[PDB]
RNA sequence: UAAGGUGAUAUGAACCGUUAUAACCGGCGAUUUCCGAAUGGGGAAACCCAGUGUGUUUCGACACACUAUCAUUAACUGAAUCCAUAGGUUAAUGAGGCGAACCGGGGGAACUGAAACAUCUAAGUACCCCGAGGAAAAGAAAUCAACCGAGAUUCCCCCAGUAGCGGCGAGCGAACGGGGAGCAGCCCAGAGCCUGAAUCAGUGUGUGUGUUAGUGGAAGCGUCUGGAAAGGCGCGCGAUACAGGGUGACAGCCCCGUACACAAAAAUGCACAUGCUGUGAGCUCGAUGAGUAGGGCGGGACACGUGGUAUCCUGUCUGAAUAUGGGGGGACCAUCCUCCAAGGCUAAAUACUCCUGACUGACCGAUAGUGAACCAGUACCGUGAGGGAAAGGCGAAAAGAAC
RNA sequence: AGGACCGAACCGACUAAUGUUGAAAAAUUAGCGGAUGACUUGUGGCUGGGGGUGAAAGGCCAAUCAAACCGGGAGAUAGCU
RNA sequence: GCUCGCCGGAAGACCAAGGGUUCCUGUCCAACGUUAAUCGGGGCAGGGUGAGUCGACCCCUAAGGCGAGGCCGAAAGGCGUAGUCGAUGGGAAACAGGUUAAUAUUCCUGUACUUGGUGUUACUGCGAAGGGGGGACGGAGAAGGCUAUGUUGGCCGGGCG
RNA sequence: UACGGUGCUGAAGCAACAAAUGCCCUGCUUCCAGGAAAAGCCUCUAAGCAUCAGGUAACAUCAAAUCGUACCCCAAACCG
């Protein structure tokens, strides 16, 4: 299974400001995730029909590496690792160093 | 000046075509060599 | 026994929709894109069954596909069959 | 036990396939060539459903 | 082809050798003749293209044993 | 198995989906147009034209199946010709064609070397053709040896560049014997004592065991420089895991993994009372592969070029003895020794890689390595057989430059 | 009537000039020979390399001919550069 | 647009072969056009090829090809009977106007024609990889009768330079 | 009238002469070098059947499928 899921409160590990923590919005097949408010890039949008007619320098989130993303623990406010140990075919995620089910 | 290539698709297909290759065992060897080389067109006449 | 309703999938698109087709509907005929292997009896039965109209004669031609791309990737569009289906009488809608 | 098309194991699969093909797929083709929006998934859904009913007609002999 | 049909003799291949020992490729052919053998059990004639050694074998063994060997080999006559 | 997906350039659009049923992966099925052995007839491949049945019919017609040739077998008919054969028709079974190498057989060069060239060599090589298998071939002494003995075939190392062959030139080149890999021998040519009584082949679960999806899988924080830390410094921790790859610079502890422990609805590779089907065991007695061995002529193969030349094969012509018999022991003859040709089957050690998977490299790195790192046997060239390229890299991320 | 005569289409190619990195890997221009015949031409077929075909020059056989072209033996051999 | 020149047994028109969208319309001018290009047989988009009567297919054969069996050949294969293919030849049938930016004996209008299937009526010997006829054929020359076509006159319309 | 052009109406529409290498003519004459084949078409019967099946004539109705069809074609679209 994937350790970082679609709606996970996660914290960045490397790159730009690595202190910020946010929620995943999309998980890509290339091993990358979109986390809310993390890699803000200023795209120079050309004019086009349908949406974004005038264009602009509106900020948009870039995909960051899921290895550069670590999950967050609310009880111990640090980065944490994820394991998959439960008895049936549905494996739950648990925090390492806390042994608590996510 | 009359040049050497004077086209005719009937004579092209009778001389170099797929069934003209398949009639003789040697033209079947030609087709085997072209499949082994991997040609996009076996008989470029056809 | 009019041909099978499975086989009456020969009609592909209603209306080629340019001045020749619209002028032919203004005077006499519907223009359709009808399969590749559809015969005139199949087009006649398919128009008369899938629509309420009555057809007198069907004229078909085969349109050859064009190349339309530069020399880096030369490709060809598909051949299709165009049917001129004559049903000029007896409709108001 | 990952897909559920046990729902149409009843009789009149020929009638169901006839309703799937007769003017359903045809009208979606006419609509897609005249121009309407939603047909992009509906055309695929109807041709897949035709494939389900034809596989079940090859599977069973009682319908 | 030039096959004995009873002893299986085919053309074999060897050399013309001369006084100067120049080897030239040649072939040795069987002494093949078409002969009608009278069979008494079938009361008829069977034509076979056989060698002279094949006719010696037919004289020694009988034509019935020979034709039984030809049917065992599957060869038509 | 899963929280994400609807293959790529390739975004969009319209949608599908919560882990108990979207997508992905695996087993088993369903479908599988037309051509092509192409197989109903034809044909300028991917097209043209049918015939016979069965069914539907709104009478316009439509759907499905079969219909090639050859071989073998069976049935029914059937001439010259009374019998019969030849022939004809139908049915059943098998084959056909493709594929890189290895293997057996049929045919088979020349350039070249001899410092020319013809014997010789190259070389039974290249090539052509036929056939088969996972190996093929060969194979259980009419074999060697030397008066001592060995005990089928095949492959490796010696013997040994020896003995020899050779315009005794160029060159070709053994065997005996020894050390190893591997190693079971049988059956018919025939009758009685026996009738599943042990092998062999086929056949659906079982055990054990691999394959075709997968599952869990340890342990890192602070700080400095920096765009970014995996780097410097400090303090820990895991290790049956410090193979490897990615991550914004060089990561055992970020991710995928790796060591290890496991997992199979189903389909499948191998040892048995394996339920059975067939062949068929051991004992006594008998037989012991004839146009054959040998010979004359011409050739070919044996390292051996006809030479003093044994041995094998046979195109031609001949032609025995037949276990008180026959073959061999390198002209030949005596003696002695050794073995039974003219009928077959036979695993292993041996050869090869179109392919599949894993791993490795004092192998290459874009004029190199495959011709081809890239939509390459492509674009182009040629009537055709055939020939045959050039062409990789923005950035960490398009943030690919709004205005 | 005529392998008759003159002369266009058509077939050919005797002379000259130009062109010779051409407009053209044999042509253009001005004349020239045949033009009812051993003529000329379209389409299709057949003959295949020590072979074909040749009113014969070793001409022609796909701009290649005292032995075509392609692939292979093949890295033939080269006392020569 | 108005003049000027050139071909006019073609340098005009229609096909066959061969090619394969070069055809028509909109847009663009980087590359391609031996110069510029607003143009193009160039680039990018759409459109466009309508048949019972034209051709192919189809029936039939020539040269020739393949060829069940067959004869021959080390193998591959060679020849060849029945047969079956093979046009460059022989068999059914449509003409004139009008129309599109681009089709045209195909679409439209007018007037036709041919070959088969089925059904009804009336009469009746029908029936064949068979027999016969016919298809069905050379070169040259010479009439005659025409016609396509052209000229002139009449007629009609316009003119009065 | 956007000057691509559209629509209505539309008079005479006859005669004589000269004419082909085209047609009659695959004819006629003449010559030697003596000039495809098979089917479609017509006719005759063989085996077979007898108010049957068929063949003629009339009428009515149905069918004639499929593929090509643009454009160049003494050429800037073919071979060079």
TrEMBL record, chain E:
Keyword Ribonucleoprotein: yes
One Pfam family named in its UniProt record: Ribosomal_L28
Keyword Disulfide bond in record: no
GO biological process assignments: translation
Family of this protein: Belongs to the bacterial ribosomal protein bL28 family.
HAMAP family, per the entry: Ribosomal_bL28
Protein name: Large ribosomal subunit protein bL28
Organism this protein belongs to: Escherichia coli (strain UMEA 3162-1)
Lineage, opening ranks: Bacteria, Pseudomonadati, Pseudomonadota, Gammaproteobacteria, Enterobacterales
């Amino acid at each position: 299974a994937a350790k970082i899921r679609r709606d996970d409160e996660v914290i960045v590990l490397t790159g730009k400001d690595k202190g910020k923590r946010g929620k995943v919005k999309n998980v890509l097949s290339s091993g990358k995730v979109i986390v809310e408010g993390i890699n803000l890039v200023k795209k120079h949008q050309k004019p086009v029909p349908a949406l974004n007619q005038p264009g602009g320098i509106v900020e948009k989130e870039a995909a960051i590496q899921v290895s550069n993303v670590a999950i967050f623990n609310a009880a111990t406010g640090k980065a944490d690792r994820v394991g998959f140990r439960f008895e049936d075919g549905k494996k739950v995620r648990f925090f390492k160093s806390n042994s608590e089910t996510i | 000046m009359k040049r050497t290539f004077q086209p005719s698709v009937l004579k092209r297909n009778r001389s170099h075509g797929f069934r003209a290759r398949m009639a003789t065992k040697n033209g079947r060897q030609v087709l085997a060599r072209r499949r082994a080389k991997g040609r996009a067109r076996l008989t470029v006449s056809k | 026994m009019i041909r099978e309703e499975r086989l009456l999938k020969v009609l592909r698109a209603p209306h080629v929709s340019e001045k020749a087709s619209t002028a032919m509907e203004k005077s006499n005929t519907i223009v359709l894109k009808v399969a590749k292997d559809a015969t005139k009896a199949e087009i006649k039965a398919a128009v008369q069954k899938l629509f309420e109209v009555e057809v007198e004669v069907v004229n078909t031609l085969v349109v050859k596909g064009k190349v339309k791309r530069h020399g880096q990737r030369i490709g060809r569009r598909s051949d299709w069959k165009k049917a001129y289906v004559t049903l000029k009488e007896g409709q108001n809608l | 036990m990952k897909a559920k098309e046990l729902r149409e194991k009843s009789v009149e699969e020929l009638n169901t396939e006839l309703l799937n093909l007769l003017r359903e797929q045809f009208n979606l083709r006419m609509q897609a060539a005249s121009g309407q929006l939603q047909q992009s998934h509906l055309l695929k859904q109807v041709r897949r459903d035709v494939a389900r009913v034809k596989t079940l007609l090859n599977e069973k002999a009682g319908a | 082809s030039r096959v004995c049909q009873v002893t299986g003799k085919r053309p074999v291949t060897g050399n013309n050798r001369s006084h100067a020992l120049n080897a030239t490729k040649r072939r040795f052919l069987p002494n093949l003749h078409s002969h009608r053998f009278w069979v008494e059990s079938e009361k008829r004639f069977v034509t076979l293209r056989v060698s002279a050694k094949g006719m010696r074998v037919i004289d020694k063994k009988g034509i019935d044993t020979v034709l039984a060997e030809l049917r065992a080999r599957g060869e038509k006559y």
